[PDB]
Write a protein that binds this ligand. Structure first.
Ligand SMILES: Cc1cc2nc3c(=O)[nH]c(=O)nc-3n(C[C@H](O)[C@H](O)[C@H](O)COP(=O)(O)OP(=O)(O)OC[C@H]3O[C@@H](n4cnc5c(N)ncnc54)[C@H](O)[C@@H]3O)c2cc1C
Ligand SMILES: Cc1cc2nc3c(=O)[nH]c(=O)nc-3n(C[C@H](O)[C@H](O)[C@H](O)COP(=O)(O)OP(=O)(O)OC[C@H]3O[C@@H](n4cnc5c(N)ncnc54)[C@H](O)[C@@H]3O)c2cc1C
Ligand SMILES: CC(C)(COP(=O)(O)OP(=O)(O)OC[C@H]1O[C@@H](n2cnc3c(N)ncnc32)[C@H](O)[C@@H]1OP(=O)(O)O)[C@@H](O)C(=O)NCCC(=O)NCCS
Ligand SMILES: CC(C)(COP(=O)(O)OP(=O)(O)OC[C@H]1O[C@@H](n2cnc3c(N)ncnc32)[C@H](O)[C@@H]1OP(=O)(O)O)[C@@H](O)C(=O)NCCC(=O)NCCS
Lengths: 443, 442
């Protein structure tokens, strides 16, 4: 008969799972509790609302009424799950604080930014960019106060996307990076260097620097590091994120080695009838089989879909991820899929690599631009372990490579794949195919 | 020890194979005979040189000296192979014979000549090799051309129409069929390109051209429907493989009309290979033999043939029929089988046709993109994908990989495809397509 399903969080994962369950079991009572006023939202668009490319209401996919009226999901907004135990959840709503039973539970509860323990992080003008309310706050601050110098702490992709959003508004932007290069955790050097030459020109890039303090009157005026000081009337916090596991721990939910919630292929946790999905959830790597945490949106959506399916008695397996990701600074596109040279080495693979430059068009169609590719290959199988791409028109290479990795293509398999050619689209030898030829499969 | 290798034709296929052989066997005598002055040339760029996007010398990649001096290939330009027999080739001024131990037909395909009167008037052109682009340019400089007429609704017709429309000319398209590209795509896909095409070109469907009229020069085109003022005509009513020399050697011709080959690109005659637009190949999905005269396949075939000639065994799996082109801002392409082709092949099929956007609603510049999918009901495998609108390349190339590997609808759904707001919407259109199908179980 009928069950009560409860879902914690109204991001991509939560809504994916709610939609899916209700879709499969219309007669079921599917409740969602979302702490904010925002549902079906894209934190991925925050830099572009901040940059001013978009109005803040566009961050919402559909109307909460679509979920409630049209799809029949008992959506509670401004509802924080504060306690959780086996079969129960405790929630605060009208002010008021009330308990609800559940037969199935989903943690779709995301991840929030790491708070670096330096003094003055709580000044007015210090911001983290994680949910849509952050975009509103940043906009209202800049309207109330004249912000001219901005300082970004962190060289991850969020740092970079945020830097772009302020540089594009004519601001003086300074980036503080602990590492020897940007994005050093997720990409190899010869790839990140290409984005850096560009970044360095539009941003004061400060490598190998540890921020000690944020100083300021009623709110932020300066940032002090182990090297120098930097004028700043706005600070963007983005020094990594961590999964929101505190409620899970209350239920004794197994936490994976990554820090995120352990799941299997069906997105089940260690606790029966309890699932986890999205940025909170640890998953599987398609190439290594190791468990890994990749808090991105497409995976998050799929996990939600998968969890819902299984909750509703329709067995379905998530194979895992490839770590596929893309972003851009100005006209410089950057992305990967599969393992970097570093990751593959860490995993004990016997690897060979290649790094090549090519063009996006033939020399007889104009507008051809530079594109660079790095490939990583297991010497014992000739299989592609990963691909990194930087320059322009990278998406078809990344998406195509991703398919290839899903299927375990070799260098020879890639070479003979029937990829498309017309002069307006690409050069006669696709850059991905050139890469494949470079390595040259053998034995 | 050393062998004499001879290669007929200096297009993509010929040069691919010559480079490859010489690369593997530097001590071998590798001769190429190319009828024109052009080597390593791209007929694919002719519309854009005609449109004026490019100067005509950019149709050649590296100088002929790169091949001769730098790579050591005995390249003969302005050399037509006129006769061929077992072990010999006859070439032309001057006419002399050369021995061969291995032979490659890299000999392309030339346009079908429709047998209507006046096709040989000044101003009537075919667009197949680079000299054609030069001829078309010099004609337009010498004579004022204002009305252009294109015969044929294939991709060449369409690319040529764009090249004349973009120059402000009055362009009229005569098409025998009920729609453009009707041979290679389904209706609900071609219709999207047509709504656009119809606005910048006088599109005349279901019309058979009877006559080209003129004095010394073309002035008009007459069809079964009306007449059309015209000072320049493009004929693009299909192409056919150049097999006449092959027949002289008794080379097996496939059911398609092109030269039969196997995976190693060998013909029915020992030590004789074929590569490129002249060659019939294999279909990766159906296993049927098929002719797809396109450039990437042509290059690969050349590479494969060379490898095997030089004692390094290598197999070409075949093609998917992947292809893309564009009219103005309307991109069009496919990979794998259309609904029509799949039905012709006896598959039990289901399909889907969806519209999506290239960005999320919060990043601007999002445009419309439509996808058709064809799926075998007994395996859930993708048989083909068709795409029209904008930003189609990542869908087509990705789908192509998927077809190479035999992905199902579920395999596609769970593929880790990329997302950022500047690149695509949260649900990639390819993934939406896959979901639409829905993996069914017995
Ligand atoms: C600036 C930025 C840029 C990004 N860019 C990209 C990109 O380019 N590409 C990409 O693939 N991914 C990107 N991501 C990641 C992407 O936004 C997430 O992976 C995706 O939103 C995951 O959805 P989710 O539901 O798992 O978690 P989230 O979307 O983070 O949302 C979780 C929700 O749960 C709610 N919640 C938390 N605790 C409670 C509680 N106790 N009670 C009730 N509700 C609660 C929160 O209010 C929150 O709204 C980006 C993220 C950020 C912050
Ligand atoms: C207008 C047009 C647009 C195109 N657009 C696309 C596209 O968008 N995408 C795509 O993938 N493909 C396209 N193609 C196809 C592509 O150009 C060919 O597949 C490719 O050039 C094949 O190379 P090939 O050497 O096999 O044949 P070809 O390139 O035709 O070259 C064969 C050569 O052999 C020579 N030859 C012939 N007979 C003799 C003889 N007796 N002796 C000596 N030499 C001889 C010819 O002079 C010719 O140069 C297009 C073709 C045309 C004409
Ligand atoms: C949209 C959403 C809530 C997930 O719910 P969903 O209903 O599974 O997603 P969709 O709205 O695409 O799917 C609706 C249904 O219509 C179908 N559909 C029909 N025509 C379609 C078309 N032209 N395009 C897309 N989907 C179509 C879908 O395939 C799906 O099928 P189903 O009925 O078998 O489930 C979720 O993706 C979401 O929260 N999105 C916005 C926020 C976001 O993802 N941002 C994350 C961080 S950037
Ligand atoms: C170029 C052509 C002659 C084939 O020659 P090829 O040697 O097979 O291909 P390339 O010249 O690209 O390869 C040269 C070598 O350097 C390498 N290389 C080429 N470009 C490279 C790059 N950008 N970065 C790194 N390495 C590269 C290749 O891997 C190749 O390796 P090999 O030494 O193992 O052979 C053939 O493709 C051709 O005729 N092209 C012109 C025709 C055309 O483009 N269009 C035809 C119809 S539109």
């Amino acid at each position: 008969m009928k069950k009560k399903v409860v879902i914690i969080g109204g991001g991509a994962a939560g809504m994916s799972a709610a939609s899916r369950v209700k879709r499969l079991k219309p007669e079921w009572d599917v409740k969602v509790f979302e702490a904010t006023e925002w549902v079906s939202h894209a934190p991925c668009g925050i830099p572009y609302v901040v940059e001013g490319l978009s109005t803040p209401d566009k961050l919402m996919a559909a109307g909460p009424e679509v979920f409630i009226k049209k799809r029949g999901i008992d959506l509670h907004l401004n509802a924080e799950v504060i306690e959780v135990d086996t079969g129960y959840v405790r929630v605060r709503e009208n002010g008021g604080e009330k308990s609800y039973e559940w037969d199935y539970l989903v943690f779709a509860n995301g991840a929030s930014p790491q708070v670096p323990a330096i003094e003055g992080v709580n000044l007015k003008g210090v911001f983290t960019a994680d949910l849509p309310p952050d975009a509103l706050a940043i906009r209202e601050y800049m309207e109330k106060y004249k912000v001219e110098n901005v300082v970004i702490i962190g060289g991850g992709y969020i740092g970079i996307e945020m830097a772009e959003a302020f540089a594009a508004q004519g601001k003086n932007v300074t980036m503080i990076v602990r590492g020897e290069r940007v994005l050093r955790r997720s990409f190899d050097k010869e790839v990140t260097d290409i984005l850096e030459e560009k970044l360095k020109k539009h941003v004061n890039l400060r490598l190998q620097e540890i921020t000690m303090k944020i100083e300021g009157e009623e709110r932020v005026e300066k940032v002090v590091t182990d090297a120098g000081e930097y004028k700043a009337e706005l600070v963007i916090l983005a020094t990594g994120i961590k999964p929101n596991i505190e409620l899970a721990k209350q239920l004794g939910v197994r936490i994976g080695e990554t820090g995120a919630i352990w799941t299997n292929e069906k997105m089940q946790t260690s606790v029966e009838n309890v699932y986890a999905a999205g940025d909170v959830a640890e998953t599987r790597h398609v190439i290594t089989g190791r468990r890994v945490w990749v808090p991105l949106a497409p995976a998050g959506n799929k996990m939600g879909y998968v969890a819902g399916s299984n909750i509703a008695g329709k067995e379905l397996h998530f194979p895992g991820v490839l770590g596929t990701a893309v972003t851009k600074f100005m006209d410089v596109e950057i992305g990967k899929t599969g393992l970097t040279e570093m990751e593959a080495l860490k995993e004990g693979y016997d690897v060979r690599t290649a790094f090549i430059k090519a063009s996006t068009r033939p020399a007889y169609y104009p507008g051809g631009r530079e594109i660079w590719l790095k490939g990583v290959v297991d010497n014992e199988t000739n299989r592609l372990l990963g691909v990194q791409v930087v320059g322009s028109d990278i998406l078809p290479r990344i998406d195509t490579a991703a398919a290839m990795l899903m299927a375990g293509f070799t260098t020879k398999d890639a070479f003979f794949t029937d990829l498309a050619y017309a002069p307006p689209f690409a050069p006669v030898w696709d850059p991905l195919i050139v890469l494949a030829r470079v390595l040259k499969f053998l034995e």
